[PDB]
Design a protein around this ligand. Sequence first.
Ligand SMILES: *[C@@H]1O[C@H](CO)[C@@H](O)[C@H](O)[C@H]1NC(C)=O
Lengths: 49, 48
Amino acid sequence: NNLDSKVGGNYNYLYRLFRKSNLKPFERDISTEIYQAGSTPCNGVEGFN
Amino acid sequence: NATRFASVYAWNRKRISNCVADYSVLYNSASFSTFKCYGVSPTKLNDL
Ligand SMILES: *[C@@H]1O[C@H](CO)[C@@H](O)[C@H](O)[C@H]1NC(C)=O
C-alpha cells in the first residue's frame, strides 16, 4: 500500500473481467479487443452489452 | 409491458414463482437502456 498507492488512485493497475474461455495454465493475454456478451456482433470500440 | 407503473414512494411488487424465466427476451432485447447484476453474471441467469 505505502509503495505505490496514490490518493486519487493508482489507475495504472489493471485486471481482466471478460474473456471468451478460461485460459490455459501460465497463458498470457494482452488483448484490448472489445468483448461480446450478448448475441449481437460489436465491431467498433464500444456498444450495447 | 405494463401500461402504468407505480411511484417510487410506494413501489409496486409482483412475485414470480412456479414458472420458467426466459432471460433472453430480457437480455438480448436492446429496447432497454441499462441492465446490471450484483451477485450473478447475466448470461448465466438462464443457468440458475
Ligand atoms: C412488448 O410488446 C411488444 C408487442 O407485443 C413486443 O414486441 C415486445 O417484445 C414486448 N416486450 C418484451 C419485453 O417482450
